[PDB]
Symmetry: C2
Subunit: 607 residues, 2 copies
């Protein structure tokens, strides 16, 4: 029997040359090649790089010097997370990026820690894909010099730190199935929702290259392309090029997501995992296993293969792997249809490289953005196709250009019928752990009644950045006055009230823009704008909170639109339940910029 | 609604001073303290050990020099696993131990890879607890000397290698929730059985200390006892002492285990996991979380707390942790009963130390052995109890001596009723990931018709060891002629036929003993005993296998008891289906010694 879909109600991500999901989409749309040489900051090429692959292996060197790298890999805001600068240095940057990403995904969804505790009794799971080690390798040389620095990678801490800080009591565990880690995390997250182990789940992954030995080892296994490219299904695919990233999604069963008014990116209709079993080699993929995997996900989802219109392939660009992936796909698909050339296929690995543990979540992000903008983006390095793959005899055509993503038409029974946009994504671990996920698009003020816009951050600098980023988002998302109430509501209930506070009473979006610009310009005496720190009136604020009579008065202030007094108190530290503003019709939560973390650089000292 | 229990149909384990489960039990029964100083083989104490704890931390040293260590930690039989000696050296010994343990657990259960493929379509999951890194830290010094040796710890490979070699296609993933890893693995294994992700599951864990930095780090966190003991619930508990181990269980739903005639160690009636959420410190356990965890497992199991008669506690022996564990337990228990002093409590950590990832499976092994022998063993270092814990006001009494384990009596409704032996086990990760499992005991030849005893190994040396170990087991398990048919059947269908073969036709157990002893003595011309290699008649054997007419003839040989010809051919490489021996009544599978792997030492070279 079929199960209800899992809604994706929040997403965060940083990928190569894409500090934000908006930049990620722009890069994907334009077919941007995000591969570069290793940054000197990570390590030097001298003594590391040897272009002759066989000589490189003989001399313990790497014949690859290319990768898709994330900017600010060592950036962190430890004060924000109640951590010391010294503590941060001990933390694997991968775990740091994931910490921020998990905070971001709650904010994207429009959730606070308080709401998760009150409404969901903290029943939130955290499933984090991770596989790379190497941070710890810097230890021994530091210890020889007497430094009391113990760099360590704790997979368990990847998720436990998040559960601790966000105050979550659902299952908290890392997923390491190598290259399929983050897609396996999504599978496990969904299954744990289905069996009631939690009511919400964070799923995702992270992948960074921190020590040069990672490249030396991949070279020793001849897994690297000498051309530094993932030529997904293209001629001359000869290995992969490594890549970095971090991403998460927030998951909740569809019926409840609709009931709670969440914004929905898409639906997970089915997921599957398996293992290849005994093949001709430990790292040799199994096309029969892959086909059964895909078929099971389709079956669980209730999806007919003729109605799948995009596949995000594993697609690492290997001579052996790429043709095997297509064999697996057609094995699954052909049980439903013999039709050919109707489904687009691609791989983001052609753009940003092989993100290993984070490859799945990166691919999911691509699918969701393709769904949002209803476009299919190019897949790179395959103008000439792998000649060993007979695509014309399969469902699949490698997407070469940016095009409209059209809803497909299938005959139910002599009647044409439009189907929604459905995509599949595969992720295959080198060790043989496989995962597949089937995703479907989601098809759903005045001076007399002004909006209350609130913003808050840990300090003035962060607050200013918040204002800048909100202004940019308003322009980028092409908001109008119709969106104002949603913006207000999201910032009200979807953001944690912090120390440095700002509040506005506005009648129009244009009004909001103007006052924020005046704020940034240094203008003061701005009409109906309030600034303050929560430390100013803390003793009084605490008295207000605990007191029945004083809370009633605040409620009356809200009922009678005494916003001047109300907003003045809020910026001074008085905490409110902004839901009290709304009698019956509650606005919707939408995506707005997450907290702009301090970008403080924390990386181990030279030995 | 309640779910049917998960049967434990196989178990393997190596623990400190216990190469076998039989030795493990003897140690537990006698209250043996298995803690020793660090073996010189692992690392030297010079430059490592400093008894002043605060001085040790200041100087990057360890104030602990004690542990529960497994013998043969670096032993492996790579040829057996189709691996090279060079390959083995690259493999983390933890992964090696787990590989052998997984092979052993199939054999204990009486399963072959072939049977798993034919009867269960390879739908077998592998869930392996692991958390320790350090093997890789030896890399940098080796690379400076130009060695092309890349020691690496791949959590994913822990399970993927097993899935590959054993040819399994169920979920294959490591579990790292720190100290609760292997108990979490059991939870995940059971849940994956319930949701149909597989039909059988291997669950367990492994834990080894391979690099001294592990102790230096535990010292830096002041987690080590200066007395090198886990004083579980005892006066002066002041930290833990580390410990090593590897263990696995094979799991299958009870109804099917009964149907297939498996031997059952016990029943998993309920399991639970959660996370502590926000506590006063990252490593500070949450008694309320623990109580809800335990209560959920009890609820899932349908177990009333008055009927639980033993708890295997996490019990690490810390000033803060031990009293919190009891608070959590009584919170769960008191929802069912206010009764006191009826349930025994203990921790194997008092015997073998804190096995971290493998602590859970070690505790499970203890519970099952206690159930098998219907005895409760001592818990050490608690003659004087922790004075901060008011045990007399709780259900619990620390087990001080070896005693009969009595089935408890509870009043259902004015009527006395005997209940089966039910135990709970807790495992708490330092990062806050918790697990609890509720386990219940399982309450179920002639010269004219001789038994066919078969043994086989990779070579003569291994075969000889097999014979020795079988003889020892016959004496140890106090078998009689009644057990002969089970022994025969288990060795027939529960063992993979290997290259070096031995077969006997016997009428009595005494006959079996005598002929095996003669074999070992070098006697030849032994009546009704056959020796051979499968390479001898390989070409002919292959012809026999593929041929319909020849197989019919073999079947007739079996039907007409032409064992002389039959056994002569089998030892020469002819493969048979021994089930053909049995018309209606099939004997039961029982526990017999697993394959005696070559003990070849593989450890990295000195830098």
């Amino acid at each position: 029997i079929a199960r209800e879909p899992i809604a994706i109600i929040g997403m965060s991500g940083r990928y190569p040359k894409a500090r934000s999901l908006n930049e990620y989409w722009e890069n994907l749309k334009s077919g941007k090649d995000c591969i570069t040489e290793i940054p000197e900051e990570r390590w030097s090429l001298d003594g590391f790089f040897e272009p002759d692959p066989d000589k490189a292996v003989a001399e313990g060197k790497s014949y690859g010097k290319w990768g898709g790298f994330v900017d600010g890999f060592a950036d962190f805001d430890p004060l924000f997370f109640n951590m010391s600068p010294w503590e941060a240095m001990h933390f694997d940057p991968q775990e740091r990026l994931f910490m921020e990403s998990c905070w971001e995904v709650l904010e994207d969804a429009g959730y606070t820690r308080q709401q998760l505790a009150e409404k969901y009794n903290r029943r939130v799971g955290v499933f984090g894909g991770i596989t790379k080690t190497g941070f710890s390798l810097y230890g021994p040389d530091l210890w020889k010099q007497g430094e009391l620095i113990y760099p360590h990678t704790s997979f368990s801490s990847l998720t436990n730190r998040v559960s601790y800080f966000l105050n979550l009591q659902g299952p908290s565990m890392p997923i390491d199935t190598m290259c399929s880690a983050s897609l396996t995390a999504i599978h496990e997250a969904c299954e744990h929702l289905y069996n009631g182990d939690c009511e919400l789940a964070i799923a995702g992954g992270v992948n960074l290259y921190l020590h040069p030995s990672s490249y030396v080892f991949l070279s020793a296994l001849h897994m690297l392309s000498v051309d530094g490219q993932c030529k997904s299904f293209g001629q001359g695919g000869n290995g992969f090029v490594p890549g970095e990233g971090v991403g998460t999604v927030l998951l909740k069963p569809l019926s409840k997501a609709i009931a709670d008014g969440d914004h929905i990116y898409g639906l997970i209709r089915g997921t599957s995992v398996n293992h290849g079993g005994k093949t001709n080699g430990y790292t040799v993929p199994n096309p029969t296993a892959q086909g059964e995997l895909i078929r099971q996900a389709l079956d669980k989802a209730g999806v007919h293969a003729k109605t799948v219109s995009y596949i995000e392939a594993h697609g690492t660009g290997t001579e052996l792997g790429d043709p095997i992936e297509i064999s697996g796909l057609i094995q699954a698909f052909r049980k439903d249809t013999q039709d050919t050339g109707y489904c687009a296929i691609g791989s983001v690995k052609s753009n940003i490289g092989h993100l290993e543990a984070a490859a799945g979540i990166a691919g999911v992000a691509k699918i969701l953005l393709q769904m949002k903008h209803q476009q299919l983006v190019p897949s790179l390095h395959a103008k000439e196709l792998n000649p060993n793959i007979p695509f014309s005899k399969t469902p699949f055509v490698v997407q070469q250009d940016l095009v409209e993503w059209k809803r497909p038409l299938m005959e139910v029974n002599g009647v044409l019928r439009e189907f929604p946009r459905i995509a599949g994504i595969s992720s295959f671990g080198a060790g043989g752990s496989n995962a597949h996920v089937v995703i479907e698009e989601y098809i759903p003020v005045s001076p007399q009644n002004p909006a209350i816009i609130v913003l808050s951050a840990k300090n003035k600098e962060r607050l200013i950045e918040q204002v800048q980023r909100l202004l940019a988002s308003i322009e980028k998302q092409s908001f109008t006055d119709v969106d104002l109430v949603d913006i207000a509501y999201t910032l009200q209930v979807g953001r944690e009230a912090m120390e440095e506070r700002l509040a506005l009473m506005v009648s129009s979006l244009s009004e909001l823009v103007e006052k924020l610009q005046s704020f940034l310009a240094g203008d003061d005496s701005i009409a109906d704008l309030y600034r303050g720190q929560a430390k100013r009136s803390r003793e009084t604020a605490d008295i207000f909170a605990g007191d029945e009579e004083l809370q009633e008065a605040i409620e009356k202030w809200m009922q009678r639109k005494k916003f001047a007094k109300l907003l003045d108190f809020w910026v001074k530290g008085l905490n409110m339940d902004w839901n009290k503003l709304y009698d019956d019709k509650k606005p919707r939560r939408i995506s707005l910029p997450a907290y702009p973390f301090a970008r403080e650089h924390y990386w181990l000292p030279k030995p």
